[PDB]
Structure 1
Amino acid sequence: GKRILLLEKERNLAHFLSLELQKEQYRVDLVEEGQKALSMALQTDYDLILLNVNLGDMMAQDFAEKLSRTKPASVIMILDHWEDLQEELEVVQRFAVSYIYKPVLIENLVARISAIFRGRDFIDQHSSLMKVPRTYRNLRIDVEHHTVYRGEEMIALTRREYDLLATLMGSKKVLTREQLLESVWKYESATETNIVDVYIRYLRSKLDVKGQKSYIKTVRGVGYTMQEG
């Protein structure tokens, strides 16, 4: 089964989530602080890393940035109280594939994790069919390693940003926000179209060079497409 790295500060909840996730045949490694979580995530490829906003010895944002130096498309999901998540909402959107509020309902957590895994699988399969060369202007995508480069620099795209780029680069046509939702949030049927604009903004911030045309064009009345220089 897929492998989950789990850090939950509430002891009884951590134990509960560990046991319930193993009933889905997932392999669950429970850790209690970020330093240990980080050493484990650096040496093992986890399919999901499930964290609180604050890991105790560091913020989850800090963990994610440090992990991203070698594994930029890591799949991190944040579980926390509403007030804790909202205090850090913008930074959480930037590094996490999803977030979920306490008090958690296990059937909901299980369904969401399943959908996230299936959506990543879809992206992988679809991107394997991308026309070669997988380049655009100064960008190149390494589909095997889920990495992106602009010139000779690695661009630390998050998993959502990577999935969004692969979807845009793999399309010959302008894509609507509904079509982008259907590809990048596939199987996460509760996702709504305004999230697409958020991640287009994030993706532009990572790709774009000041004084060049953006890598992504907004097409009036339609949606988004890659943009030439």
Structure 2
Amino acid sequence: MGHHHHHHDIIDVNGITIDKNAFKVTVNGAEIELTKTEYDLLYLLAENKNHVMQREQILNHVWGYNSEVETNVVDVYIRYLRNKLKPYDRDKMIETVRGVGYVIR
């Protein structure tokens, strides 16, 4: 009785705990509510924490499912992510890479 990776592959990156099966995000036990897009954004960054996520790479995974939007939309939504991560000081986790994308340091 403790933790299980099966049935619910949870991601733990720099204080963040993403529930993939419950679609909930936690830090410090606090439950953050993300959207279909914003959850996909954070999850993408979290799982690929050590990988610099190009805007279009994010754009292609999150928006890649019938959206037809400019990849700069990603930057915009990431900014909103920061806002929601502010109370948890997790906004700093998303490092901006000008011309490339975003990454979790």
Identify whether the pair has TM-score above 0.5, normalized to the shorter chain. Answer: yes
- 8 Å CA contact 1:134–1:141 kept in 2: the answer is yes
2:24 counterpart (147, 152, 165):
147
In terms of fraction of residues, the more strand-rich structure is 2
Q: Tell me the residue number matched to 1:94.
A: none
C-alpha spacing 1:217/1:202, structure 2 compared with 1 (3 Å): same
Deviation at 1:187, TM superposition (A): 2.9
Aligned to 1:205, what secondary structure does the other structure show? helix
Q: Paired residues, what number?
A: 97
Q: Tell me the residue number matched to 1:225.
A: 103
Q: Tell me the residue number matched to 2:73.
A: 195
Aligned to 1:214, what secondary structure does the other structure show? helix
* Structure 1 runs not aligned, ≥5 long: 1-127
CA distance in 2, matches of 1:143, 1:150: 14
1:178 counterpart (43, 51, 56):
56
The one-letter amino acid of 1:135's match is: D
* Structure 2 runs not aligned, ≥5 long: 1-5
1:24-64: CA deviation from partner (whole Å, max 9, x where unpaired): xxxxxxxxxxxxxxxxxxxxxxxxxxxxxxxxxxxxxxxxx
CA distance in 2, matches of 1:213, 1:207: 5
Larger Rg: 1 or 2? 1
Higher relative contact order (CA 8 A, sep 6+): 2
Q: % of aligned pairs identical?
A: 44
Aligned pair 1:158/2:35, yes or no? yes
Deviation at 1:202, TM superposition (A): 1.1
Give the TM-score normalised by structure 2: 0.79
Q: In the TM superposition, what are the counterparts of 1:73-222 in structure 2 within 5 Å?
A: 134-171=11-48, 172-188=50-66, 190-209=68-87, 214-222=92-100
The one-letter amino acid of 2:43's match is: A
Q: In the TM superposition, what are the counterparts of 1:25-36 in structure 2 within 5 Å?
A: none
The one-letter amino acid of 2:78's match is: I
Deviation at 1:208, TM superposition (A): 2.7
Give the TM-score normalised by structure 1: 0.38
CA distance in 2, matches of 1:163, 1:212: 16
Superposed CA RMSD: 2.3
Deviant stretches of 4+, over 6 Å: 210-213
The one-letter amino acid of 1:205's match is: N
The one-letter amino acid of 2:26's match is: Y
Deviation at 1:220, TM superposition (A): 3.2
CA distance in 2, matches of 1:210, 1:150: 7
